[PDB]
Design a protein around this ligand. Sequence first.
Ligand code: CHL
Ligand code: CHL
Ligand code: CHL
Ligand code: CHL
Ligand code: CLA
Ligand code: CLA
Ligand code: CLA
Ligand SMILES: CC1=C[C@H](O)CC(C)(C)[C@H]1/C=C/C(C)=C/C=C/C(C)=C/C=C/C=C(C)/C=C/C=C(C)/C=C/C1=C(C)C[C@H](O)CC1(C)C
Ligand SMILES: CC1=C[C@H](O)CC(C)(C)[C@H]1/C=C/C(C)=C/C=C/C(C)=C/C=C/C=C(C)/C=C/C=C(C)/C=C/C1=C(C)C[C@H](O)CC1(C)C
Lengths: 35, 223, 64, 218, 218
Amino acid sequence: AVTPSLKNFLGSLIAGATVLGGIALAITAVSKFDK
Amino acid sequence: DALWLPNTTRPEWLDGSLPGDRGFDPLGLSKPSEFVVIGVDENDQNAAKNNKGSVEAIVQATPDEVSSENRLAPYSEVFGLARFRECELIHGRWAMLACLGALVAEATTGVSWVEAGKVELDGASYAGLSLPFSITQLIWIEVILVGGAEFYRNSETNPEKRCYPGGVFDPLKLASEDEERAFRLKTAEIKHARLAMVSFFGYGVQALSTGEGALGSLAKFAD
Amino acid sequence: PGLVTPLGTLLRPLNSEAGKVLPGWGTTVLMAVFILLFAAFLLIILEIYNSSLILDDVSMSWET
Amino acid sequence: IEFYGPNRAKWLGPYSENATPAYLTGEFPGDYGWDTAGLSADPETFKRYRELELIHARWAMLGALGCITPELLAKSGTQFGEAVWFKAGAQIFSEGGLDYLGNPSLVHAQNIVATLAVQVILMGLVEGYRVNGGPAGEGLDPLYPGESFDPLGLADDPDTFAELKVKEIKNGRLAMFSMFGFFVQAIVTGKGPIQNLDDHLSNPTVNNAFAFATKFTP
Amino acid sequence: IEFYGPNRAKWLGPYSENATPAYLTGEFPGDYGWDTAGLSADPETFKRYRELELIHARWAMLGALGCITPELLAKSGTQFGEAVWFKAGAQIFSEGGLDYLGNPSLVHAQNIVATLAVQVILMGLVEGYRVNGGPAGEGLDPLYPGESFDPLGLADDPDTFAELKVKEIKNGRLAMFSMFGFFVQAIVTGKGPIQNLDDHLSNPTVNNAFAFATKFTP
Ligand code: CHL
Ligand code: CHL
Ligand code: CHL
Ligand code: CHL
Ligand code: CLA
Ligand code: CLA
Ligand code: CLA
Ligand SMILES: CC1=C[C@H](O)CC(C)(C)[C@H]1/C=C/C(C)=C/C=C/C(C)=C/C=C/C=C(C)/C=C/C=C(C)/C=C/C1=C(C)C[C@H](O)CC1(C)C
Ligand SMILES: CC1=C[C@H](O)CC(C)(C)[C@H]1/C=C/C(C)=C/C=C/C(C)=C/C=C/C=C(C)/C=C/C=C(C)/C=C/C1=C(C)C[C@H](O)CC1(C)C
């Protein structure tokens, strides 16, 4: 019983996790590169 | 020989001297790990330049599981075998009594352990014999008697005898003065306790799954 | 050498554990998991209350 | 009648198949020397093919018996809804999910992608354990572990152990042959195999296999 | 080097059976060790498998991007008539031939068998060049030539060039996996892939893949 509001909602909880993961990977890609 | 993981990496602080010892720590909650002690900061605001805590100051306070006399927190630490054995044994004995009592009450009366309170606050019918009490007096008598029992069981200072007391009163038949016989009886009791705790957890999950009786669930199961 | 009460004898092991704190990380990552779940919970109830997230059993009609 | 040494019984018979593929003379169960392609001249590759044949046999026994059993139960004394191993997949989308054992009081499972995700996680963990051991005993044999996997201890005598090896791989080759039979008749008859057995018992000679021979006509 | 050597990132992580098959221990990019079948026990055969895999990867990149492109162009700013790679083949037979970009101001070739003949001639010449080594660079390596047909030539620093080797192989395996996905979707749904992505975004929990799971039944 998923409405279209919840349908387009859960992609945002996906997308914010992808943004924070991109932040963390941008940290790891240059931080442990330099050190 | 008969571990939960049969011939794998054993935990260091589990050997087999305890009866139900099968080398079971993925979490390591019984670890002998120390505790880094940080002193108090300079909380004297009479003078200038107060400071903060002290990093790697003390020798980190080698943890001990010796039972003290203080009625509030006797063992002085929680993470240890000298508390966890007693907690497992007491939870297992209450779970054995409760799991037997729910089945016997459902078999005799026909009312679940869930719905027993709704049929026993209006009438105190132990198998339909109409006891004279009421709920307030039941709570008073229950609290004062079980409280006296618990304040008398905490008074024992032997860390062995806080779960394995022995003597004359509780071992009525003296069948635990032997070495290997009592070891076999303890390692049987702990397995029956581990079964009963998991099955009362199953009773709770069946109660969460829209009502049960441990045979009312079977009446649902009937086909 | 202060003042002694029976409550002063009772409550002392509660005021005994001064500084026994863990080295390493401890339960920090699990704490972070609970914090993220709590933030998602607040986001859920906020969008329900704003009705940017329409559900089935939620009426929002000022009527029940 | 010994299945080992130089005197193993060939698949042919008294024709001992002169000029054998010479890279196997006994020493392993199931050896008949039937290597016509000869894909395993290298012994490491040959060991890998032993591993792969063993794992496929031990899957194929369960894949056989799970496809036999519920049709027998539904014909004998129960009802399962869609008791045929074709429509066992489509049982989920039918009414309200898959009711196991034909009972609408037990499992009653939906959310097929969640079931698949649970299956992926569980099978990945048990295969990652299966390859290099870890728990469940030290990783000791990629072929025949049997430390806790033989909890009755039938690996005591090595001669009887080799006998059980030979019985194991004979029965495994039979199961792997039978499952390919199921997969071919799955396309051919579109029916249950016990129904096919009853149809053969009805018509042993006039509807046996060649009635279903004019299907794939372009 | 973390990417390849004694401590390469093996293909199953902690459960990656950390004692490789001894016929390969690093020495080449893209090496994890996933030859469980053992089909490359001989080093010359293993060299042939690299020779085949790198060429399939380098065709798989262009085969991926050529199918990603035209529906994105049709969404953004163009139209092609039939902008879908399914019916792109019949566009020469459509009305008067095919129009690249949908533009009859450029090539617009007809006589599909003559275009096939030109394709056969030019591909035979360039594949013979790739095999032996001829003009526009003499053959020195069948896989990593590196000569004046590199207008930038990033093979100067050996460590960064090995990193580029690893990146090329990883993108190649990903392109192969993607094109296998395109082929299986071409079998199943009969729809454009970006259309399939939009349909899954429209219906995630019902039109995922198991809606198209009752098709190949008897
Ligand atoms: C005495 C003579 C003797 C003969 C003739 C055979 C025969 C055979 N044995 Mg052997 N055996 C014999 C002795 C013994 N065998 C065995 C135990 C075994 C085992 C365990 C196995 C064999 C196998 C084999 C086969 C090896 C090659 C093969 O796989 O062919 C297979 C290919 C064919 C038979 C050709 C197919 C002919 C078929 C009629 C075609 C159908 C026509 C279609 C209509 C065409 C389709 C049309 C389409 C295009 C539309 C071969 C058929 C192997 C086997 O059976 O694999 C299948 C095998 O695993 N034998 C024992 C006991 C130890 C024997 C003792 O006497
Ligand atoms: C792994 C074994 C397995 C096999 C062989 C099948 C195959 C089947 N499923 Mg099934 N499933 C399997 C497991 C699972 N399925 C499902 C979920 C479903 C659903 C919802 C449905 C099916 C249906 C079907 C049928 C489709 C007919 C067909 O596509 O013809 C192709 C197959 C054949 C012609 C013969 C089969 C063997 C043949 C040699 C091909 C197999 C190739 C490879 C061995 C498979 C590749 C291995 C993988 C791991 C890479 C057929 C019985 C449909 C159905 O019910 O139809 C009535 C259907 O609706 N399945 C799940 C949960 C996600 C599974 C979990 O393991
Ligand atoms: C953490 C544990 C871990 C697990 C479980 C896996 C899992 C896997 N990795 Mg992997 N990896 C893991 C760690 C790591 N990997 C990698 C990097 C890689 C790479 C580069 C590759 C893998 C590959 C693989 C696969 C190797 C085995 C195989 O071929 O599948 C065989 C088993 C199956 C295919 C079973 C799948 C079940 C499926 C649900 C069946 C579908 C059911 C159908 C309904 C039935 C069919 C019906 C019929 C009709 C068709 C496997 C899926 C390989 C791969 O991706 O191949 C595809 C690969 O190339 N991994 C890294 C980085 C160093 C890891 C570090 O932690
Ligand atoms: C080599 C790559 C190649 C592939 C994969 C295709 C495939 C296709 N062409 Mg095509 N063509 C290809 C090259 C060429 N075509 C044409 C000329 C045409 C015409 C005129 C038409 C097609 C059409 C088609 C479609 C036929 C549907 C079908 O048969 O389903 C089977 C295929 C699948 C289900 C997917 C693939 C499954 C499998 C992985 C096949 C792969 C086979 C091998 C692994 C790869 C080949 C190896 C080579 C080196 C021998 C399909 C999209 C028709 C069309 O567009 O209809 C709408 C059509 O009218 N082609 C020319 C010029 C002569 C080509 C030269 O490069
Ligand atoms: C640090 C940067 C940052 C922050 C704080 C925000 C914050 C916000 N943005 Mg925003 N944004 C950012 C960067 C950021 N943005 C960037 C870089 C872009 C360009 C792509 C955008 C483009 C953008 C648009 C286009 C919109 C927003 C909007 C919003 C608002 C609502 C978002 C929402 O509901 O999601 C809620 C998200 C969460 C609660 C986070 C999910 C956390 C849960 C618990 C999951 C846990 C993590 C998950 C597992 C992933 C981890 C990966 C794992 C593998 C480890 C919010 C104020 C909206 C707006 O302006 O409102 C009008 C909107 O429409 N953003
Ligand atoms: C009848 C087929 C058969 C036979 C003869 C064998 C034989 C053998 N297996 Mg084996 N195996 C089989 C099927 C079989 N297996 C299947 C189907 C699986 C997958 C589950 C395995 C998985 C397996 C492993 C993982 C291991 C073996 C091992 C062994 C060897 C020693 C153990 C032994 O004596 O088993 C004798 C077996 C039998 C006599 C078969 C008895 C069949 C009973 C009577 C039927 C009961 C089935 C039951 C109804 C199923 C439902 C119950 C379920 C719901 C719980 C020997 C080669 C071990 C080994 O080689 O290491 C040393 C080992 O580690 N096998
Ligand atoms: C064009 C196909 C092709 C070929 C020839 C190779 C060749 C090779 N790969 Mg490779 N690989 C491929 C595609 C291919 N790869 C794809 C698509 C992936 C991503 C999943 C990988 C991922 C991969 C890893 C992670 C590793 C290799 C490795 C190797 C090398 C040793 C293994 C071997 O003997 O393979 C010989 C190859 C063949 C005999 C080709 C068989 C083609 C079959 C018939 C295809 C159909 C079966 C298939 C399994 C069906 C299911 C498809 C499904 C998995 C999507 C060898 C050079 C190892 C290495 O060191 O890298 C250099 C290694 O660790 N591969
Ligand atoms: C030796 C030799 C020699 C020469 O020289 C060469 C050559 C010829 C190459 C060779 C041969 C080979 C062979 C014979 C092979 C075969 C194979 C097979 C058949 C397999 C199967 C195999 C098979 C198998 C695994 C099977 C499996 C099964 C399964 C999964 C199943 C599943 C299921 C079940 C449970 C039930 C449910 O309800 C459903 C289903 C889902 C259905
Ligand atoms: C390694 C190993 C190891 C172990 O031991 C064993 C085993 C497992 C067996 C193995 C594995 C293997 C595998 C997996 C393989 C796979 C492969 C693939 C998938 C490929 C693809 C592959 C793929 C590919 C090439 C593709 C390509 C493509 C192309 C060209 C395309 C083209 C096109 C285009 C542009 C578009 C247009 O309009 C048309 C066309 C014409 C259509």
